[PDB]
C-alpha cells in the first residue's frame, strides 16, 4: 500500500533482472525451470523464460510485453536490457522510499537523462560505408559468435546480406524487406545452398526444373529475391532462422544507423563515465537522482565480469578510468574479462542497438514509477 | 543377519568441521573479532584462542578435545591457533576422497607421521640463523609489527611496536635471561583512549594520599619501606602519641642523614595501613610524600625494583633501606592516585600502562600485549628465525611433491596419505587471501609461478605472500617472521589432533550419571 | 550558515551575529568515537555465550 | 540509552561508546550517535556490492586523518 506497494514492485523486477544477468554474451549461462506440472525448460534465452513463467507479481507482468517489443527489433542481446529498468528501481531506494523524492521529479530527471543519453550515443558514433561486402560480413557475424555455426556462417550469412540489399535500396532509404520468401529444405549438408535472383514460383537465360522431395523449381524473370536453405540436420532449421532470418535486424539497423558503437556490452562504459560529468554541470535538486543513473549504468557491464569470474569492484576501477580519460573507444573483453579495447576486438554494433535499449528502458521505468499501489480482487 | 557394524563418513565429521568455517573468518590480520556477552551486559570482544574454545559453548563434543589440545598451543604460541584447526578441516574432506574408496583410516595415519619427520628435515634448512646478542632492533620491530597487525589495527601497531621491543629488552641480557613470572604488572583502568597508552620502566602503585599539598612531579625520592603505620588511633591517648612522635623524629633524622636539604634529593614513605591526615601536615612542611593503604604484593616488589630493603619496625633505619628513582610522578584519576616510579638505575621489571574506556577495548589490548610480548620473547630464545608470510607452508608442499618414491619410497598405500597432507598446507595461505578480498586460487597461482623460477635461478631465496598487492614478495622486506618454537609444536600438534579425529569410526552414549 | 526561522526560503544566514558555532574539541572526538564504533561493529563475527 | 534495556548485544557497541564522549567532553552526544549511526547505514550499500571490510575500515581511518588536517 502506497510506498510499501512500490517496494514489492522494485523487488519484483529486481528478482527477474538478476536471473537474466548471466544471459548476455558468448559466456552466457543457462537457467533451469520447474513448473507445477513437472516439466523442465533449460535454455539461455530469456524470451521463452518470461513466457512460460506465470509471475504472481503484477509489476513483473509488464516486463513480458516489453520483451516482445525488444525482441521485435533485434531479439539477440536485447533481453538483458530489462536489467537497466530494474537497476533504476533499485537506485530509487535511497531516494524514493527514503528521501521521499516525488516520482515525476525522477521522471523529469529521466527525461533529461534520456536526452543527454542520445547526445552520448552521437559521441560514440562511428559511421561506416555499407557498399563494402567484407565490412558488412564481419558485422552480421557479431551475433554468430554465440553459436557453433561460426565456421558454417561462411556459406550462410552471405545469402542474407545479398537478399536484403535487393529489397532495401532507397525510396529516405525506408523500404519493406518483408517481400523476401525463405524456403527451408530438411536434410543434407549445410554447405549446400541455392543462389537465385528473381521470383520463385524478358530475354530469360534458361528454364529448368530440379529434383527436390519438397517441391519443384520454377524461375520467373522480372524487369524481389528468394532464399532456399538446405539444413545440415533435421531440427537444425530452427537455429538456422535465428542466425539468418532473425539476423536480418543487423542489415536493417546498419541501413537506418550506419554508425557503430562498441559491441559486447562495451558501449555503456563510456556512457556511465560521461553521464557523471554531465551531472556536475546541472547544479540543481534533480542532480542527485540524475547522477545516480550512472550508478545504474555500471551494473550492466558487471554481468560480463560475473560471467568472466572477475571482481567487478577492482576491475572496473581501471576500466572506468580508460573511458573517462584516454578515449571512449575502449571496451571490455567478455570472454576472459580483459582490458583489450574494441579496436582489436573486431566487433561493433549499430547505435540504434543502445538507442532502442535506453529509450524502451526509460519509458518502461517511468510507467512503473507512476503506479502508486496495486489492488486485487475486483472480479472483472 | 550380520551387516550392522558402522560406516565412517561425514556424520563423525559434522562435529569436527563445525569450527572450521567459524574459525576461518578470524584467521589472519584481515580477520574479524568475536564477542562474548553475558546477562549483565559485559562484552569481551577478541578473536584470541582463549575465547574461541574454552569460553565458547557448543553442543559439539569434539570442541572439548580441541579446547584441551589448545592448552599447549596457547602456552607455547597463543597466536594463530585457528591455523591448526583449518588443517584438520581440510583433511576431513580428504577422507571422502580416499577413505570412501576403501582405504583404511590407519593407512593415511602413516603419511602424517612420515610428514612430521620430513617437515623437520625441511624446517632445518628453511630456518635462518640470527645472533640475538647484538641487540638488533631491526627484526625486533618487524616481529612485533607482524604480531600487532594480526591483533590490533595499524594505529595501535605504530605505538605499541617500539614499546614491546624495549619492554622485553630490559630484562634481556647477554645471558638471554627473560623471566615473565616475576614481571607482569598489568594495570587495568579506564582512561582516555587505547591509542594514548604509554610505557613505564618501573612499578606503578595504585594508592596515594589525599592531602592536597602532596607533590605530584618529583625529581627523585628515597623509598622507605614500612610494614607498620604510625597514626592517631582510639587507644591514655598520649601514650600512643609518644611512640609515634618519637619515631617521627627518626624519620626526619633519616632525611638529614641523606642530606634531604638538597633540592636534588627527595624523600618518601609508604605504609600498609591508613595515615592520620593530621600527621600529613608535618610531611607537607618538609615536602615529604606519604602513601597509605599499600598492598602486601606491591610492598614486596619495591625491594627488587627501587633497590632498597624491606623494613618492618621504624626503630631500625639504615641508608641501605632507602631506594633510588630517577623520575617520580603522581597522577590523580578518580578516587585513587597513581604514583609513577621510573628511570631507576637498574630496573628489574617494567610495565605497559593500559588506556581505554569500554570493557571490550581493554580486553582486546589486554591479551594482545601479553601475546605480542610472548611472541617476541621466543625470538630472543630462538637463535633461528623462521620466514613467515606463508613461505613455510607453500614451499613445504612443493618439497613433498618433488620427492615421493625417490627418497621415502612409498609402496603406493601411503602415497595418498603423504599427498593429502600437502593439500592442507596451502589452506593456511588460502584463507589469508580470502580475507583480503582477492581470489584465493589466482593469487596462490602467481606465487607458485615464482617458486618455479626460483628453482631454476640457482640461488637461495624465499617467496613471500603480500595480501595488499596480491603478488609475491620477500619475507625480509615484508617483515613477517616466526619464531622457531612457534612452528615446532604447531606442526607436531597438528599431526596429533588430526589423527585422533580420523581414527574414530563410531560413537556411542553410555556411562554413569 | 543555515538558520531557519522565517528565512527558510533563503536558507542562508550570518552565524557571526548569531554567534552559532561548534566546539572544535567535540568534533575531533566525535569523528574518533564514530570511526572506532563503526569499525567495531564491522569487526563483530559471532556472539559467544559462556555457561548460560 | 542508559535507562533503556536493549536485548540486542550487537547494537550495544554504540551504547558503551557514549562513555568515551562523556569523559572527554560530555557534549555533542546526539551528534556522535547520528554520525556513527549514519556511517554504518551508508556502508550497507558497499556490503551488498561485495566490498570487504578491509578497505571500508581503511577508508574511514584515511578520511579521519584528513578531517583533522582541515579542522
UniProtKB/Swiss-Prot annotation, chain A:
Q: Where in the cell is it found?
A: Cytoplasm
Tell me where it mainly resides: cytoplasm
Cysteine pairs bridged by disulfides in the record: 223-225
SUPFAM superfamilies (UniProt xref): GroEL apical domain-like, GroEL equatorial domain-like, GroEL-intermediate domain like
CDD domains, per the entry: TCP1_gamma
Q: Which UniProt keywords apply?
A: Acetylation, ATP-binding, Chaperone, Cytoplasm, Disulfide bond, Nucleotide-binding, Phosphoprotein
PROSITE patterns the UniProt entry points to: TCP1_1 (PS00750), TCP1_2 (PS00751), TCP1_3 (PS00995)
Q: Does the keyword Cytoplasm apply?
A: yes
Q: Does the keyword Ribonucleoprotein apply?
A: no
What is one GO biological process annotated to this record?
chaperone mediated protein folding independent of cofactor
Read off the Pfam families from this record. Answer: Cpn60_TCP1
For this UniProt entry, the molecular function terms from Gene Ontology, in alphabetical order, are: ATP binding; ATP hydrolysis activity; ATP-dependent protein folding chaperone; unfolded protein binding
Question: In the UniProt record, which is one GO cellular component term?
Answer: chaperonin-containing T-complex
This molecule's function is given as: Molecular chaperone; assists the folding of proteins upon ATP hydrolysis. Known to play a role, in vitro, in the folding of actin and tubulin. In yeast may play a role in mitotic spindle formation.
What family does the database annotate? Answer: Belongs to the TCP-1 chaperonin family.
State whether it acts alone or in a complex, and with which partners, per the record.
Heterooligomeric complex of about 850 to 900 kDa that forms two stacked rings, 12 to 16 nm in diameter.
Q: What is the protein name given in its UniProt record?
A: T-complex protein 1 subunit gamma
Q: Which organism's genome codes for this protein?
A: Saccharomyces cerevisiae (strain ATCC 204508 / S288c)
Curated annotation (Swiss-Prot), chain B:
- Give the record's keywords alphabetically: Acetylation, ATP-binding, Chaperone, Cytoplasm, Nucleotide-binding, Phosphoprotein
GO biological process terms held by the UniProt record? chaperone mediated protein folding independent of cofactor; protein folding
- Pfam families from the entry? Cpn60_TCP1 (PF00118)
Q: Which InterPro entries match?
A: Chap_CCT_zeta, Chaperone_TCP-1, Chaperonin_TCP-1_CS, Cpn60/GroEL/TCP-1, GroEL-like_apical_dom_sf, GROEL-like_equatorial_sf, TCP-1-like_intermed_sf
Cellular location of this protein? Cytoplasm
Which terms does the record give in the GO molecular function aspect? ATP binding; ATP hydrolysis activity; ATP-dependent protein folding chaperone; unfolded protein binding
Matches recorded under SUPFAM superfamilies? GroEL apical domain-like, GroEL equatorial domain-like, GroEL-intermediate domain like
Gene Ontology CC, one term: chaperonin-containing T-complex
Quaternary structure per UniProt? Heterooligomeric complex of about 850 to 900 kDa that forms two stacked rings, 12 to 16 nm in diameter.
Give the function comment from the record: Molecular chaperone; assists the folding of proteins upon ATP hydrolysis. Known to play a role, in vitro, in the folding of actin and tubulin. In yeast may play a role in mitotic spindle formation.
Q: Which NCBIfam families match?
A: chap_CCT_zeta
Q: Which family does it belong to?
A: Belongs to the TCP-1 chaperonin family.
Task: State what protein this is by name.
Answer: T-complex protein 1 subunit zeta
The organism encoding this protein is Saccharomyces cerevisiae (strain ATCC 204508 / S288c) (Baker's yeast)
Protein's gene: CCT6
Swiss-Prot record, chain C:
Domain of life here?
Eukaryota
List every position bearing Phosphoserine. Answer: 8
Q: Where in the cell is it found?
A: Cytoplasm
Q: What subunit structure does UniProt give?
A: Heterooligomeric complex of about 850 to 900 kDa that forms two stacked rings, 12 to 16 nm in diameter.
Q: What family does the Swiss-Prot or TrEMBL record give for this protein? A: Belongs to the TCP-1 chaperonin family.
The record's function comment reads:
Molecular chaperone; assists the folding of proteins upon ATP hydrolysis. Known to play a role, in vitro, in the folding of actin and tubulin. In yeast may play a role in mitotic spindle formation.
Name listed for the protein in its UniProt record: T-complex protein 1 subunit theta
Which gene is this protein's source? CCT8
